[PDB]
DNA sequence: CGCTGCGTTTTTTTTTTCATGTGCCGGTCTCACACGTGCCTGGAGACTAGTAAGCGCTTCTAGTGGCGGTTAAAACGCGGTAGACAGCG
């Protein structure tokens, strides 16, 4: 029972939810609690992690700024 | 393997029909406005009379300046933070 790396947890959930707009923080957060396991902050962690993927170019942004909008996978 | 574009399949947006409720015209029937008539009460006349109120005069209050002094209170401005407003699901 463990929370693998920010990205190694989102990678797993965004991966099972095909969408033309993609997957958006609300959706993602609802997955992790569903099947995996966590205490809390997670949601605040998920945001910074997704911000790390925005800047670098790991996970694209569909529409919106910060942790508001839709965030897909690499290619 | 990775990309890249380019025909495909779908989505978005445009244009044209289309089925809907609108308010628009012109003929029938109803009971409500308007008239009227006749009776009765409440307004008018007029004069009486008694008292309220308005004007001037008496006083004296309580309202309007005005004079500085000290302080508490406004002013102003700078600095940052949390709350207003938009945007996403
Ligand atoms: K007075």
UniProtKB/Swiss-Prot annotation:
Superkingdom of the source species: Eukaryota
Stretches assigned to the H15 domain: 2-75
Annotated compartments: Nucleus; Chromosome
Up-regulation conditions: Both the unedited and the RNA edited versions are induced by butyrate (at protein level). Only RNA edited version is induced by DTT, vinblastine or TNF (at protein level).
Residue positions where Citrulline is found in the record: 20
Similarity-based family: Belongs to the histone H1/H5 family.
Role description: Histones H1 are necessary for the condensation of nucleosome chains into higher-order structures. The histones H1.0 are found in cells that are in terminal stages of differentiation or that have low rates of cell division.
Protein name: Histone H1.0
Organism in which the protein naturally occurs: Homo sapiens
């Amino acid at each position: 029972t463990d929370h693998p790396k920010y990205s190694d947890m989102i990678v797993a959930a965004i991966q099972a939810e095909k969408n033309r707009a993609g997957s958006s923080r609300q959706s993602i957060q609802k997955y992790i609690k569903s099947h995996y396991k966590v205490g809390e902050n997670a949601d605040s962690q998920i945001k910074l992690s997704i911000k790390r993927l925005v800047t670098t170019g790991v996970l694209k942004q569909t529409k919106g700024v910060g942790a508001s909008g839709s965030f897909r996978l690499a290619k």
